[PDB]
């Protein structure tokens, strides 16, 4: 039994066969957790400000015996609030201050300090504080930073083969990507040669790095290569062979294994021969001599007598070499194997290519490649090389990079340094060689286990560290200079650089941007968006065909559907419902553990790596009561290959069908009946919705709408409240019960609604109350309803009656016919708020004042303007009427007898000012909602600016006096209680306080003393109230600061009511959209048998071409709900008994298969019955899961109870000819929504306006009455038509030909219709530009 | 300096950028060097400033070629003189008719149900602004505007007489329209403007196919011809009434495919026999009886007298009375038919290709005006009957064959047998995979056959024979057969088993998708289905640009051609033969 | 429509030539492009005569 | 443009406004369609003078 006091008013019917196990999470933890942990005081330094400090904080002078340290950082409290910052337009940030410590040591003492300055902290800027809704108030405006997805730092063994080779061969390169520092990569040549490349520059020899890494040739050869003994003594030439160690190479001749011949001459080696030569112990066997020649010597040797470099390394053996080396050097020689069948040198080939064999010679080459000039001096090259990769302070990639490194190298250890190591590169090269020879599988860039996301916390920390190191450099400079001083710790500590850097990172960034405020769903999914571009990932939308392809590992991590259809397709994705971030950078997917068939309810989060190991079943499976399965074989995925498996093979279980779906797609019913593309466009355009005046609850639901509305933070919810005392249109106060009440507080919770506020999309946001009065409200219950919301459910759109029938071509392809009733019903009516602002801009000639004394204007225009020049609140305006009368002072003139005479006649103007008043742009009409004025301190004109301050102060005193009154009432009740039984009737206390007769002495020992104590309690409370009101007043009228050029700022907001009309972009929820083409009257449209006409006529041919069965299902459920609502409304009209309606609605609820158990008359009392019915008196709220919705038969019985035909087709009669139609038409009630693409905004045209200074062309894209632009492809089409005169008209009359435009205008006025070409000024500009170069050009005759 | 305006950003600072900063640098460098040149500087120093001056000059000419000079606080380099010449932001840029248009901009597209082809619906909001100079001229001519300022004041006040004179001016004046993306010459057409109180224009539906519009969110531009010769070119060459056939291959561009086709198919049909089967009349009475009572368009075995007109005589037609039986709809449309065309040709199911041939033959024989007005009346009747027909759709329209489950059982049994014989070791992985593919393909084919058999002409109706399997009346079936909307492949995805749709990159999954949207879909099936849609969307988006680039290259390379000669008087040419390769001829010498 | 000029006493070459696909100065003097670029920066000191 | 401009400057050639793009850039009737007859008359006149 569910109470759901806030929801018990109206309960939506669900149809979920599977039972809910895990609830939907807060769905916004990712946005807030990163910020919280970044600003969190952690006991250990692992991230956030702590690690950013401990990175490079200790500052030491250049042998100055001085040091700089800190204790801890303290964040200052915000000066203003969210609403305060919004109104002021300031950025909501947080001050920061850290206690420091400067310690100096005198000379001639090892670490012997003499003084400390660990007594003064310093201040460093403000950190932009993040809101309660995962947002920021930067410059008053609200913006969202989208999380960035990129490849995790680590090593990548990529093939990079195919057609890109252009040689019919495969490639094998390795790439390492540090989180910071240069990029070191190694490419493979088609000549079987590796090459070192850094930062995509000129390649380098593979082995030059090893020589630079103090490695001799013999060391490298003995390490990477295996050497056979080659023990040839007394010219026996007897070779040690292990057939198991190496085999597969045919034997030519003279082959024996332990005496008798085991492998015949000219016969291929066989596994039998290998087996017998391994089983039979084989010693050094005489071989033919040519085997020496092909083999290469391992190490550079010397003769026994003389130490020459005879038989130097990387040299094949020679027969003439052979005898002399045998007689001089030795008899047994280290050599190689070079089993090209399974191996390949690939380095010994490159070894001879290397021109430098000394470490110094190799070290100069890398510096030369880095620096083309300024050759090193045995000091620059080594320092540069060490700082390049072996530097902790300059490479320092990450711990996650080391973890990925070890994981790729199968190392149990996961903790390492940020620097590299020689053995690391050695094993990387060896692994590359093994892979090239064949040892395993290649990596996968698109695999989600190889790519990680980034949150705002990590990037904020990176920005802070970048700003911090720059300042620390100057700090070290100032410590090394003039160190002999005991000044305060502010010698080089500047907050300006760090503050500017953090502001720029927050302010202007590719990832930083405003959110779409039109829809709460749009906001919440915008905060759940994921990208790959920006400072990393992908630099541009180009260079990718499969990167945007759907990897199989996107199963339960991101939505495979929610993505834009623009050129950024496949680059922006939304998280799944239950997706959670990994510890470092990845995503985790919860799953239910399956043990020996039964499924354990415990959840486990898995990555792309773990998921590919175990066995995970599909949610579309039958479960027994005990956790067993109806069928032994169930389809499961192991390594991306779904197939049936026995119940003993499954290892894990899904959570829900929505685990693969994002929030936006989850809200569309019957996804399994609609095309993927259709769902894609529907979800995309759903974000483009706009709320109307009356938000209407959808009748068909998915359940997640309630969670979306509550977690959106757009409405008001109840926190620790017990009962509502007073309700206002914008003010809400709830009295919490003593159970959830802690002492020391009054015990009242006030909430003020948002009323008609402009959004980032210039829309209107308003929060409507829900409860009536005196209603016991529980914690977590919604209190108000914002835009596109209804009773805690996101209600964006209206449920409109529709039909699928071609009506005279008005639904030809994508044209939508609308009802005059809807216009009369005012459905889809939109309200838009526009902002206009003005500034004074004090000049050299003088200040600019707003005194409403505008010359050369009539009093009629001035009628609507107030004394200071503003328009009265609530007034209406059309066209270009003046808003605020501002004037610009003019420089004085001489005596000017004409001007002197005019002033002696007219005066009060003397041409001292110019009309700089503020007026409406043309083609704009509306009314003013409110005005705002901002004046900087130091100027106190304030003609009528006191009114808004007075209103604010009245609001503050009103909502501050209430808690004081409540506490006073409690204290006075206490004092009335204490005078009881003291001989004092309550009548005296009721008449006057009198301080209870000023301690008359009811007890004379405690009554006097308790009365006194409570008297100072009252006095202290009075003082606290006075202090609070004074402080708030100071915070209100303190004034603001503006730009230095600006003097004062005035802002005005206006309301516009836009009504539906032909040309509006109208759409549904199934990837279906249309345009309004006609407002048909009600009478023309067809009507049913009962005379109720349809509302919307829609084309029935769209579905077959686009697979939109979900639309028809929506129609059938619409009839179900409409029949139920009409029946219950009729029952209500009849004024029947409670029991009949109760049993009727219980029947309406308990029906269907086993989905959910809920019964009335046990939880809901009588007094809830009529209100619950009146809630759902116009329809049945029905919820349908994403992939567990109702069935066709089910909706058939639904329609049966509705007294409706199961077919869904109903006869209609023409509204025009009054004739019955054959082929009865299915009708529908569609939860249709209006989009932002409204015709009044697209309304644009021009005849002739101002032109550009350059090229003398008209403005363009509607920028102050612009004009449309022509194109080259258009004139190609025109030339194919070949209307040359039209082309000349375009090029001359409507173009930059200044002398031609006026001529043509005068001709048209005179009706001449003659065209005078002239010659375009753009050509003149081109000619001048060519002549600006040293180029001769001229036009001949 | 005029071509390089100061462009004050804040008003306080002009900040002349990308044009004068290079100039300033070079100027001060040259001044310093020339002043130093008179002071006998050391050779190294003066050579250094000479090198720096040469570098500055080169960057001023071509910054991108050598070195890198950036703007203040922006890593973006400066726009040099070549930069404003070549590239996508030079002067070879939108100066070749890429300039802005004074009289055009951002109109919205709606449906022109009425307002026949030689017209266009120009909302009054569009008017009274574009033709404003014409309004001023007419007002001055009519004596109602003594002064220009008075005319402007009256126009801004929007008087009724202003509307009257606007209507007078617009009456005999053509206008042209242009779809912004067009791949052919026919993207621009001229129409007669008509004022309707609204905000969006009504394009005639038949022309929308040429415009490639689809009535979704779309924008339109309008251009007004001013000179008389411009209007003459508009009415003789830009006019829709002249552009009927395709200039690419020769097919008639104007070809209805929407509700008109299905309405035509429906009006000309017969279940078995409607009310009044045996009635015989003249043919004008057909509508008389259908509208009132006694007859329905589905009536069969109806004879009438048809006076066919045939142009057998040279340039002359003769009448011919005929008494063939037909249906109600054909007799009704016969009045719409002009004289020249015969009746036996239109005595059929009258599908989409049928009406295409109707238009082709009517234009070929009669001419331009008759076929134009005939098409107008045809589309009028098509809308009238489509509204009349109703033509509903419902979950009961499509039928899932019952044998589908048995076919699935047999296919899965065969799959199990293949798996068993594979585990037996006689079959390899590739052979078994190919066999499974073939088995599933055969199952798909038989399912398609079964659903078509369920949907084809299998519908017994009461009659003296009581067994009359005539064409069913499934709306999907009519729209697929007539070809107005839908195809066999699409309906295969709707009633029966979906298919393979298995292509991650190039491979094919062994297990196909066995369902249809009517019965919902599996989570796994829906997940695996989206790959093809994603690939198709990506292909479209990435190939639009490639197609545009190819078209631009083609038009650039093939611009110089023009007809300046009549005859070459040459006997050299090309032998032309039919293409005969493979199984048969792919196209005749026709 | 009016021009302004600068004397530029020091000699100066044109980057458009001797830098495109054909080296105009190189094609005229039969002189390698690399050496031309080197002497264009006062660091090659080619002989005159 | 840059390479083409350098080549044309080196050659010192002319346009003669024969190409349709030349008429487009200049802003005069193209020798095609309606403008074909006018351009033919102009060419005949220029042949005479």
UniProtKB/Swiss-Prot annotation, chain A:
The name under which this protein is listed is DNA-directed RNA polymerase subunit beta
Catalytic activities: RNA(n) + a ribonucleoside 5'-triphosphate = RNA(n+1) + diphosphate
Describe what happens upon changing residue 813 to K: Disrupts the enzyme's active center
The record's annotation in CDD domains points to: RNA_pol_B_RPB2
Which organism is the protein's source? Escherichia coli (strain K12)
Provide one Gene Ontology biological process annotation: transcription antitermination
The family database entries (InterPro entries) matched by this protein are listed as: DNA-dir_RNA_pol_bsu_ext_1_sf, DNA-dir_RNA_pol_bsu_external_1, DNA-dir_RNA_pol_su2, DNA-dir_RNAP_su2_dom, DNA-dir_RNAP_su2_hyb_sf, RNA_pol_bsu_bac, RNA_pol_bsu_CS, RNA_pol_bsu_protrusion
> Which UniProt keywords are listed?
Acetylation, Antibiotic resistance, DNA-directed RNA polymerase, Nucleotidyltransferase, Transcription, Transferase
Q: Which family does it belong to?
A: Belongs to the RNA polymerase beta chain family.
Q: What does this protein do?
A: DNA-dependent RNA polymerase (RNAP) catalyzes the transcription of DNA into RNA using the four ribonucleoside triphosphates as substrates. Resistance to the antibiotics salinamide A, salinamide B, rifampicin, streptolydigin, CBR703, myxopyronin, and lipiarmycin can result from mutations in this protein.
The superkingdom of the source organism is Bacteria
The UniProt PTM text for this protein says:
Acetylated on several lysine residues in the presence of glucose.
Q: What is the effect of changing residue 680 to M?
A: Resistant to antibiotics salinamide A and B
Q: What is its EC number?
A: 2.7.7.6
Q: Which Pfam families match?
A: RNA_pol_Rpb2_1, RNA_pol_Rpb2_2, RNA_pol_Rpb2_3, RNA_pol_Rpb2_45, RNA_pol_Rpb2_6, RNA_pol_Rpb2_7
Cysteines paired by S-S bonds: none
Swiss-Prot record, chain B:
Residues involved in Zn(2+) 2 binding: 568
Tell me how the protein is altered or processed after translation: Acetylated on several lysine residues in the presence of glucose.
Protein residues bound to Mg(2+): 214, 216, 218
What would changing residue 537 to R do, according to UniProt?
Resistant to antibiotics salinamide A and B
- What's the superkingdom here? Bacteria
Per the record, what is the consequence of mutating residue 492 to C/H/P/S?
A: Resistant to antibiotics salinamide A and B
Q: What does the annotation give as the result of altering residue 529 to A?
A: Resistant to antibiotics salinamide A and B
- Summary of the protein's practical applications: Co-administration of salinamide and rifampicin or salinamide and myxopyronin suppresses the emergence of resistance to both antibiotics.
Name the reported effect of residue 517 to C: Resistant to antibiotics salinamide A and B
Task: Please describe the quaternary structure of this protein.
Answer: The RNAP catalytic core consists of 2 alpha, 1 beta, 1 beta' and 1 omega subunit. When a sigma factor is associated with the core the holoenzyme is formed, which can initiate transcription. The rRNA transcription and antitermination complex (rrnTAC) consists of RNAP, NusA, NusB, NusE (rpsJ), NusG, SubB, ribosomal protein S4, DNA and precursor rRNA; S4 is more flexible than other subunits.
Q: Which family does it belong to?
A: Belongs to the RNA polymerase beta' chain family.
What job does this protein perform? DNA-dependent RNA polymerase (RNAP) catalyzes the transcription of DNA into RNA using the four ribonucleoside triphosphates as substrates. Resistance to the antibiotics salinamide A, salinamide B, rifampicin, streptolydigin, CBR703, myxopyronin, and lipiarmycin can result from mutations in this protein.
Q: What is this protein called?
A: DNA-directed RNA polymerase subunit beta'
- Stretch of the intact protein here: 247 to 836 of 1407
